[PDB]
Amino acid sequence: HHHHMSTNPPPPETSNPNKPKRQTNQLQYLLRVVLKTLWKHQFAWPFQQPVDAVKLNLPDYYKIIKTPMDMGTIKKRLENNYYWNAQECIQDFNTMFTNCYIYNKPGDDIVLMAEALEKLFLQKINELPT
């Protein structure tokens, strides 16, 4: 079974022509302010693209994580006006952080990074437009 090597699943979709979409002030804020400041963080790098289980040598990642999400996927979704409301985008951020905590253990370097971005994310969404 040497040909059976670890592979990544297809990444989450960033467009869907049959999904209803909207452009709200809150969604514009989520891209302009929330994502674009998190994106510039020193700890942002592990979350700027889907977990590449092949490259990072984590063949068990997608055996554990069944609803993957990352800021690269969120950024593309926000830029593509993929979302209907802010809650949908916020749920994607929540999913990204929770996956990191599920897959890893408290105190891991990746977890300490996720906790730091999560606290900044909650700070930034504390006040949304309207």
Ligand SMILES: O=C(/C=C/c1ccc(O)cc1)c1ccc(O)cc1O
């Ligand atoms: O970068 C890593 C993991 C990132 C990550 C991102 C999101 C998650 O939900 C879980 C892990 C990583 C993991 C193991 C390793 O040896 C070297 C590495 O660089």
Ligand code: NA
């Ligand atoms: Na865990």
Ligand code: NA
């Ligand atoms: Na705010």
